[PDB]
Design a protein around this ligand. Structure first.
Ligand code: DGD
Ligand code: CLA
Ligand code: CLA
Ligand code: CLA
Ligand code: CLA
Ligand code: CLA
Ligand code: CLA
Ligand code: HEC
Ligand code: BCR
Ligand code: BCR
Ligand code: BCR
Ligand code: STE
Ligand code: FE2
Lengths: 442, 36, 153, 27, 244, 51, 97, 137, 37, 176
């Protein structure tokens, strides 16, 4: 009874054609990943930083430790080519199975096989399918562990000497650390899981997640939902979709904040500096310049009475001054050598700033993630010249948009799933209008 | 201030538990047509 | 004096505000006397001319020009790189006619004070105490009449 | 050209529809 | 044991000066054939007292307690300078550089905010003669400069300022200016303050000293717009001495 | 020289009479500064009557 | 009695030359050979009683004294003005482009 | 108005010898300036040190004068401070520091001439806008 | 850039990532052909 | 060019402060609100008049019966928001009334601006701020922004006036 513009809803009870829809769609995802990587590589120029070149997939591979050496210099582009080709080739196989199951295959699976066939209302079968996929996901998290510990390591922006690829021999297992993250506040100076700042915690979290997913997968293969869960949920295909839409929405919002604040699993060598980073680097830059001229940046009082270069945070830490006072929670490998126990150390600042830190501050200040939609870099009043929008702005905005619409999609399908399960999703029965059998409010 | 902190932690926890147990208490069944 | 008083932006009907109520005297005050015509010169004896405030602007900078339109003095906002200050240019003011006829002023803050008034046109002495005038321009009956009738129409 | 390839690729999709419509396929 | 940044951050400990153990009752001897510097001077205020105005004649108001509203942003630290031995054996500390100022605003009863530039800029502090040793009864007395709380570029809310900004009340084009001159003409004040530092602990091995201080100075005058208040500041201090 | 009765205060003295003497802003009618009256300040009494 | 001291300074030689006691360090770029090195020394060693005092800056090479000698006519000295030298404002007076 | 040889004529050295660029050279120098310099020097200012700009009168007063092709090509190989006293290859992109500033690696000698030429030409076209900052935007 | 041996396909690669967009557009040609049933 | 016209009116007329504009804003945003909330209400109080999952097909333009329940809509909004419409004629008149009246009101304010009869200032605020350099509001902050707008756009926006503002007269905060 669905119109053409809701035509994919005709697939709800046709398990075979829906399988083809899904597998064909999965081919599309794999195709883009293969095609986009090759497009990026074809355009790549190694002498330019990646973030000056509109790259979003090559940075993901380099972060896994392929193609790069110390300082994030690209040493070898062949791993990029391989990742692209292999994804590209694999989409043809997914495409093939996809359109076979959608056009030629059995329309409904339940007659061909009792293993692959399913009823949405079959709570036992649904949790088994769920369980299988939890195991797949657990295996996937373990592959990242395997790469970090047994197959060459990961890129580590914190590595001494400017960053490098590093094998992770002691992943964090202490659950006070791992789950400690899940209980940190999401507010400033804490930042929930987005504050993860070392590969040992990253690798250790994926060991934990891998095991938990596999355990839960086996759990749900072996059990059926308990009655308290049976009475709490709507059990239908559209309900299930609505649940996943909400989960994807939450996940997109998290990824948005991850790429905007985190410079560990999104190294600034590849993705450009974060907004906080670039703002801290401007204060560093003019600190350095003015001090070279003879300024005593420690004792310089600015117009407001606060320090022109240096001030205190609300809890006393010595921090950069100006509007960047808001960004003092920023930590980055070019800045940390200047920190002592009370914050920025005036003696290190006077004596120990290195040329590579002056360079990196100047580079990051001039690549702040500000730009126009037509890719003019800098503040909105800047003139044309610099063709630049940060990969972080591209990745943050795109995934905020997608996360928002998926929350709307959650609301849409959750409300309809509820109304359809109760039997009034098509409208009110004229002969049995509930309100007409209720007492008036006044 | 800590008296205030504890009081608010307790009040927020209370209202959150009402919310969660309330929706766990057969909410699909509270509609005017088909309650199951 | 009657003709000079017409050459003064405080009588311009497009200088009021919607909720600035009452007579024009309540704003700049009751006009008492024409102070005279202010003539500005730099240290080289060049006669300078104050750029007059256009009706669009609630506020306007103090810029002094020569007969050819070249900027020769101003009151600077940022002082550190000022090139055209009254202090640097030795700007003076001399009055002809009116109440200050034949008087010349050289001290920079007095000279600036008359330059701030010359953007309004001819310079007048006002009684601001009698009506407790607040110093903010109001429109004339020409303005209020036009406003009401265009809105009713 | 780049426009030669994208023309051939772009022509493929609608050509499938046409072949099936002209042969009364399962559209 | 030593604390790292990640131990301190967010605790408030970053605004606290290092303390000495209550056993540190030694003495640091002074070799006049030797030059000395203060490698670090740290001053942590604990109490802000503001003098009231008694409006009347010879009553003279007292210093009243105030509440701090600007949080843990008050300490002076990393101050260094020469420690000179004088002809009479008095020592004189000459401040050279460091984080030697903090804007502070405290609230008096009734809600008046009093901002001040808590500082020891250009501090010169001396001892009594014939010191020869820094002990748990050595006092340092001195004076320092208190520059204007806002510096020359600061613009008031109508855009008026000293080295920048408008020179008149542009929103009142035909108001008489003489009533407005105090608000229209900014001035930069430079006053003196006084400070006592009382050494109460001395680590004779390491050259660390710690103790108590009281300073007196003026609060903010908003570039001449109003009269300042007198302020009394008490706290603790720490300093480390090195052979120069 | 400027007590409440010079200021046309009418209910203030009835709160003072039975023991309410300080304000949340830290002054007291006796002239003492730096006092904390707790809830039962002049402000708290006013609030209580509104509720 | 209420006078803007910065405006008053614009009426002295400060308003026409590089005031060795007051001017921000960026102004030494107007003449060749002065920035940044000699500018740094000049500012660190202020104030000066006479324009000729800058030749007595300890450590000058003969080439640096030659640069200074050639530029003495573009220098001046007035009384130090607290408002212009506080805040480290001779190194950064809040003016960029 | 158009790009005439007269605007495309710039000083080659301090002696006053001149060179006339082609339009091709100008457009190429502009592209290379954007590629390797504009992130800090857009419009002739210096974002990380606004006290020093690329205006002709500024370059003329640098030691080594830099208001000519030779002085600019040399600056791109071995940049110094404004008074000539210190070499700054370690914090300023140059051929001498192309290992740490990788965009400088694939620049040829003729590219340096084109970049230098664009810098000398552009103030002839834009006037005060070149190196003037947001005031003239 | 792509490895030398594949440089022949460079213009093809500049076009490939658009291809998934063509599947969405193709769905509306298909519905145009059967009349939005 | 219309975007330029918006910003001109802020900088020169302080048009956002004008109560006739504010009534216009309330009429346009109130109109859009009414549009969305009425459309959503009808679509979510529909009667089941067909069996399809697409509910559009179950309406006939010559049918006498209301296609949605006013009674259920009224109870929903009464319990959600406190009040609801109960009269279909009043509701649709009100939908006419709100955006029309809003636009008429903004027109009146622009007639005032034809004469520079602006609602530019609050005299009490200006008197206090002139005498008390510590007094600051969002009102005084916005006028500083208008003053920047005027000085920085006027030379290029009114080229016939031949405004020459030397850099030293331009109002600017610190650093920027
Ligand atoms: C199911 C029911 C769910 C109900 C949950 C109810 C509680 C939800 C609370 C959410 C609101 C929290 C606001 C977060 C504010 C903020 O600071 O959030 C940002 C934080 C990240 O925090 C930042 O984290 C940073 C981590 O970086 C640090 O560590 C890095 C390591 O590389 C770097 O070194 C970096 O320099 C260093 O600072 C720092 O701590 C910063 O100080 C800190 O601000 O993100 C986060 O915690 C990530 C997740 C936040 C998502 C919030 C987005 C909300 C989207 C609203 C949706 C709109 C919907 C429309 C409805 C219609
Ligand atoms: C995993 C994600 C997912 C899945 C599987 C579904 C699945 C379904 N949805 Mg849901 N939906 C989702 C996400 C999802 N949705 C999100 C995120 C939203 C909010 C935006 C919605 C909002 C929504 C509504 C409002 C409705 C559905 C409906 C449906 C059903 C029919 C849809 C159909 O045939 O579309 C047909 C597809 C189209 C008409 C194409 C739409 C074109 C889009 C909107 C524009 C694309 C623009 C793109 C960004 C750029 C284009 C570039 C250009 C060059 C082409 C089906 C069961 C319908 C329903 O209730 O069925 C029960 C229904 O009415 N969905
Ligand atoms: C990722 C996107 C996606 C996917 C995978 C599907 C998949 C499907 N749709 Mg949906 N649909 C979509 C988007 C999508 N749709 C959008 C955007 C709309 C809005 C216009 C619709 C509207 C819609 C309607 C109205 C209906 C469907 C139906 C169907 C199913 C049967 C279609 C059929 O018989 O085709 C027959 C068409 C052909 C045989 C023509 C050729 C089609 C082939 C597959 C093109 C392949 C081209 C490609 C280059 C081949 C590569 C081969 C390579 C691997 C070797 C199928 C599972 C139908 C359904 O549910 O059936 C009950 C149905 O009635 N869809
Ligand atoms: C969803 C994630 C995502 C993100 C973050 C990016 C981000 C980027 N891409 Mg990629 N891209 C994506 C998906 C994504 N793309 C997809 C799905 C395709 C296939 C068509 C491509 C194909 C593609 C090509 C072919 C190219 C890029 C390029 C770029 C860069 C410039 C983007 C630009 O100017 O857009 C301009 C902005 C728009 C067009 C706005 C569209 C907004 C829509 C219409 C509204 C959204 C409605 C809702 C969804 C930037 C790094 C360019 C580049 O620099 O490559 C090196 C480039 O040439 N991308
Ligand atoms: C999740 C995706 C998915 C699912 C659930 C199914 C399910 C099904 N398919 Mg379909 N199929 C898929 C993907 C999928 N297929 C793909 C990708 C292709 C293209 C190769 C096909 C092509 C296809 C054809 C041509 C046919 C089916 C048929 C069938 C049915 C019987 C299969 C059987 O007996 O097992 C056979 C089991 C095996 C051969 C075990 C081998 C395990 C595989 C090959 C390796 C494991 C994959 C690994 C975990 C991940 C991939 C690696 C990659 C990431 C690098 C069953 C309903 C049949 C049918 O419906 O007939 C009426 C049929 O003829 N399928
Ligand atoms: C894709 C993942 C996935 C999905 C969809 C499900 C789905 C389901 N599980 Mg399984 N589960 C999973 C993974 C998953 N599980 C894994 C990996 C494990 C191993 C740890 C388990 C272990 C497990 C057990 C032990 C049980 C289930 C049960 C259930 C059912 C009830 C779920 C429920 O009411 O939760 C709704 C959630 C709650 C009622 C409590 C919420 C508590 C969270 C932590 C609050 C936090 C919210 C906050 C905003 C986000 C921050 C997170 C915080 C921790 C920092 C449902 C079928 C139940 C069942 O019937 O099994 C037979 C059951 O008893 N699951
Ligand atoms: C065409 C009519 C008209 C005009 C142009 C004038 C003009 C003038 N009068 Mg006169 N006056 C009039 C009618 C008029 N008057 C009438 C009818 C009365 C009797 C009430 C007076 C009584 C009067 C007195 C007592 C005084 C003046 C004075 C003045 C002068 C100052 C006016 C002033 O401050 O305005 C102020 C105007 C406003 C602040 C505008 C208010 C309009 C509001 C904002 C509109 C409300 C809109 C409404 C809510 C719309 C919502 C509709 C929606 C629900 C649909 C000026 C020359 C004064 C003067 O200087 O005398 C010597 C003086 O003291 N007038
Ligand atoms: C930021 C990382 C920069 C990039 C990229 C480029 N330049 Fe630069 N430039 C920069 C600074 C901080 C300075 C001042 C250096 C100093 O301390 O003196 C400069 C200076 C110049 C100059 C001298 C200008 C003068 O008035 O004397 C020139 C001629 C110059 N820079 C040229 C130049 C070129 C050609 C660039 C691209 C190849 C380039 N710069 C990039 C900062 C940065
Ligand atoms: C169902 C359906 C649908 C859908 C569909 C789909 C979605 C599908 C997919 C499909 C797919 C998903 C496909 C794929 C394909 C692929 C391929 C076919 C590939 C190939 C490859 C190659 C051949 C490559 C080559 C190369 C190399 C190897 C190297 C480098 C270079 C190059 C690139 C050249 C639609 C909507 C339409 C309609 C309705 C129905
Ligand atoms: C990897 C990693 C890591 C780790 C992580 C982890 C460990 C995680 C976990 C996570 C988790 C563990 C999560 C959880 C979540 C949960 C949730 C999200 C929930 C949900 C809920 C809901 C949704 C519900 C609802 C409801 C209610 C409330 C009532 C009744 C009805 C219902 C049921 C509907 C780290 C960070 C270290 C680092 C990096 C990496
Ligand atoms: C990788 C690769 C490959 C593959 C490829 C493919 C996969 C393709 C596909 C393709 C496709 C997939 C295509 C499609 C296309 C389509 C189109 C072209 C469409 C169009 C459309 C239109 C234009 C529309 C219109 C309309 C309608 C119809 C209705 C409504 C209205 C409108 C107007 C919208 C090959 C083989 C080459 C080899 C090499 C590599
Ligand atoms: C859906 C199937 C997708 C399969 C993707 C696997 C991609 C694996 C790429 C591994 C790259 C290794 C490169 C090492 C040097 C060659
Ligand atoms: Fe209607």
């Amino acid at each position: 009874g669905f119109a053409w513009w809701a035509g994919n809803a005709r697939l709800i009870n046709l398990s075979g054609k829906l399988l083809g829809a899904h597998v064909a769609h999965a081919g599309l995802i794999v195709f883009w990943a293969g095609a986009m990587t090759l497009f990026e590589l074809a355009h790549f120029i190694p002498e330019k930083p990646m973030y000056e070149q509109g790259l979003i997939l090559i940075p993901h591979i380099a972060t896994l430790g392929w193609g790069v050496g110390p300082g994030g210099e690209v040493v070898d582009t062949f791993p990029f080519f391989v990742v692209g080709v292999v994804h590209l080739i694999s989409s043809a196989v997914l495409g093939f199975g996809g359109v076979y199951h959608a056009i030629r295959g059995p329309e409904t699976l339940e007659e061909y096989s009792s293993f692959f066939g399913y009823d949405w209302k079959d709570k036992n079968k649904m949790t088994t399918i769920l369980g299988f996929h939890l195991i797949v996901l657990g295996i996937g998290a373990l592959l990242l562990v395997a790469k970090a510990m047994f197959f060459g390591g990961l890129y580590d922006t914190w590595a001494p000497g400017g960053g490098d690829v590093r094998v992770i021999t002691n992943p964090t297992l202490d659950p006070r650390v791992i789950f400690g993250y899940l209980l940190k506040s999401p507010f400033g100076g804490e930042g929930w899981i987005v504050s993860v700042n070392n590969l040992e915690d990253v690798v250790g979290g994926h060991i934990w997640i891998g095991l938990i997913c596999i355990a839960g997968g086996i759990w749900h293969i072996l059990t059926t939902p308990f009655g308290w869960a049976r009475r709490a949920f709507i059990w239908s295909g559209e309900a299930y979709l609505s649940y996943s839409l909400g989960a994807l929405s939450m996940m997109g919002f998290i990824a948005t904040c991850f790429v905007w604040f985190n410079n560990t699993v999104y190294p600034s060598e590849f993705y450009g500096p974060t907004g906080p980073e670039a703002s801290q680097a401007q204060a560093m830059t003019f600190l350095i310049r003015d001090q070279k001229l003879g300024a005593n940046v420690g004792s310089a009082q600015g117009p407001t009475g606060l320090g022109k270069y240096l001030m205190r945070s609300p809890t006393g830490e010595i921090i950069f001054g100006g509007e960047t006072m808001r960004f003092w929670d920023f930590r980055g490998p070019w800045l940390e050598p200047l920190r002592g126990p009370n914050g920025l150390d005036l003696n290190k600042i006077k004596n120990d700033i290195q040329p590579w830190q002056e360079r990196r501050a100047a580079e990051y200040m001039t690549h702040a993630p500000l730009g126009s939609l037509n890719s003019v870099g800098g503040v909105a009043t800047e003139i044309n010249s610099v063709n630049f929008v940060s990969p972080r702005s591209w990745l943050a905005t795109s995934h905020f948009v997608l996360a928002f619409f998926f929350l709307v999609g959650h609301l849409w399908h959750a409300g309809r799933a509820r109304a359809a399960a109760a039997g009034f999703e098509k409208g009110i029965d004229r002969e049995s209008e509930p309100v007409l059998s209720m007492p008036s409010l006044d | 201030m800590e008296t205030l902190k504890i009081t608010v932690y307790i009040v927020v926890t209370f209202f959150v538990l009402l919310f969660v147990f309330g929706f766990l208490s057969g909410d699909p069944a509270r509609n005017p047509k088909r309650k199951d | 004096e009657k003709l000079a008083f017409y050459d003064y932006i405080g009588n311009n009907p497009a200088k009021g505000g919607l909720f600035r109520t009452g007579p024009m005297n309540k704003g700049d005050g009751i006009a008492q006397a024409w102070k005279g015509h202010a003539v500005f010169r730099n240290k080289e004896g060049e006669e300078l001319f104050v750029r007059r405030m256009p009706a669009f602007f609630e506020s306007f900078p103090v810029i002094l020009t020569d007969k050819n339109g070249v900027v020769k003095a101003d009151i600077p906002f940022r002082r550190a790189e000022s090139k055209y200050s009254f202090e640097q240019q030795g700007v003076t003011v001399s009055f002809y006619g009116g109440e200050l006829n034949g008087q010349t002023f050289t001290d920079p803050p007095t000279v600036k004070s008359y330059a701030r008034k010359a953007i309004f046109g001819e310079i007048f002495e006002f009684d601001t105490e009698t009506l407790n005038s607040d110093g903010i321009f109001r429109t004339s009956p020409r303005g209020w009449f036009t406003f009401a009738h265009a809105v009713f129409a | 050209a780049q426009l030669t390839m994208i023309a051939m690729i772009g022509i493929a999709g609608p050509m499938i529809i046409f072949l099936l419509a002209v042969r009364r396929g399962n559209l | 044991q030593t604390l790292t940044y990640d131990d301190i951050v967010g605790t408030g400990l970053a605004n606290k000066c290092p303390t000495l153990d209550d056993t540190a009752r030694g003495a640091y001897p002074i070799d006049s054939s030797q030059t000395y510097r203060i490698a670090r001077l740290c001053l942590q205020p604990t109490t802000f007292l503001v003098k009231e105005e008694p409006k009347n004649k010879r009553q003279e108001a007292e210093f009243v307690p105030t509440k701090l509203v600007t949080r843990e942003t008050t300490s002076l630290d990393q101050i260094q300078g020469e420690l000179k031995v004088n002809s009479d054996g008095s020592l004189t500390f000459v401040e050279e550089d460091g984080i030697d100022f903090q804007p502070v605003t405290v609230q008096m009863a009734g809600g008046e905010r009093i901002p001040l530039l808590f500082t020891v800029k250009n501090l010169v502090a001396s001892t009594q003669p014939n010191v020869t040793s820094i002990t748990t009864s050595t006092d340092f007395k001195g004076e320092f400069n208190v520059p204007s709380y806002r510096t020359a570029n600061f613009l008031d809310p109508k855009g008026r300022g000293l080295a920048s900004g408008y020179d008149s009340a542009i929103a009142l084009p035909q108001a008489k200016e003489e009533e407005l001159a105090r608000a229209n003409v900014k001035r930069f004040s430079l006053t003196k303050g006084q400070i006592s530092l009382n050494v109460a602990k001395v680590d004779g091995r390491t050259g660390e000293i710690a103790g108590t201080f009281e300073s007196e100075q003026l609060s903010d005058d908003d570039m001449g717009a109003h009269e300042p208040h007198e302020v009394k500041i008490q706290g603790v201090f720490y300093a480390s001495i090195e052979p120069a | 020289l400027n007590p409440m009765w010079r200021q046309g205060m009418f209910v203030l003295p009835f709160m003072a009479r039975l023991g309410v003497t300080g304000s949340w802003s830290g002054w007291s009618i006796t002239g003492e500064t730096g006092i904390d009256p707790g809830f039962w300040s002049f402000e708290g009494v006013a609030l209580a009557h509104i509720v | 009695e209420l006078v803007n001291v910065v405006d008053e300074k614009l009426g002295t030689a400060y308003g026409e030359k590089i005031d060795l006691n007051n001017t921000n360090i960026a102004a030494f770029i107007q003449y060749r050979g002065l920035y940044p090195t000699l500018a740094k020394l000049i500012v660190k060693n202020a104030p000066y009683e006479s324009v000729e005092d800058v030749l007595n800056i300890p450590g000058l090479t003969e080439r640096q004294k030659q640069i200074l000698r050639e530029n003495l006519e573009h220098f001046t000295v007035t009384e130090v003005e607290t408002a212009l030298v506080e805040g480290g404002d001779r190194y950064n007076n809040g003016l960029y482009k | 108005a158009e790009l005439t040889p007269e605007v495309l004529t710039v000083p080659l050295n301090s002696e006053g010898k001149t060179i006339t660029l082609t339009e091709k050279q100008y457009l190429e120098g502009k592209r290379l300036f954007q590629y390797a310099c504009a992130s800090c020097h857009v419009g002739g200012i210096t974002k990380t040190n606004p006290s020093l700009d690329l205006r002709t009168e500024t370059l003329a007063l640098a030691t080594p004068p830099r208001d000519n092709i030779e002085g600019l090509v040399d600056y791109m190989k071995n940049p110094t401070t404004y008074d000539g006293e210190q070499e700054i290859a370690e914090v300023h992109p140059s051929l001498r520091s192309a290992d740490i500033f990788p965009k400088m690696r694939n620049l040829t000698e003729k590219d340096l001439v084109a970049i230098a030429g664009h810098i000398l030409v552009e103030p002839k076209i834009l006037g005060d806008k070149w190196g003037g900052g947001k005031v003239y935007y | 850039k792509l490895p030398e041996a594949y440089a022949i396909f460079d213009p093809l690669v500049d076009v490939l990532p658009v291809i998934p967009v063509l599947f969405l557009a193709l769905a509306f040609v298909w519905q145009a052909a059967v009349g939005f049933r | 060019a219309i975007f330029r016209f918006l910003l001109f009116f802020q900088g020169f007329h302080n048009w956002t402060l004008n109560p006739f504009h504010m009534m216009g804003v309330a009429g346009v945003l109130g109109g859009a609100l009414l549009c969305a909330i009425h459309g959503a209400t009808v679509e979510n109080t529909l009667f089941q008049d067909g069996e399809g999952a697409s509910t559009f097909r179950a309406f006939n333009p010559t049918q006498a019966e209301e296609t949605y329940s006013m009674v259920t809509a009224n109870r929903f909004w009464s319990q959600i928001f406190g009040i609801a419409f109960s009269n279909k004629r009043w509701l649709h008149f009100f939908m006419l009334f709100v955006p029309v009246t809003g636009l008429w009101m903004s027109a009146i304010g622009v007639v005032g601006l034809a004469l520079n009869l602006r609602s530019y200032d609050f005299i009490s605020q200006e008197i206090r701020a002139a005498e008390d350099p510590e007094f600051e509001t969002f009102y005084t902050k916005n006028l500083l922004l208008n003053e920047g707008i005027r000085a920085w756009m006027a030379p290029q926006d009114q080229p016939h006036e031949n405004f020459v503002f030397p850099e030293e007269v331009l109002p600017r905060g610190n650093a920027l």
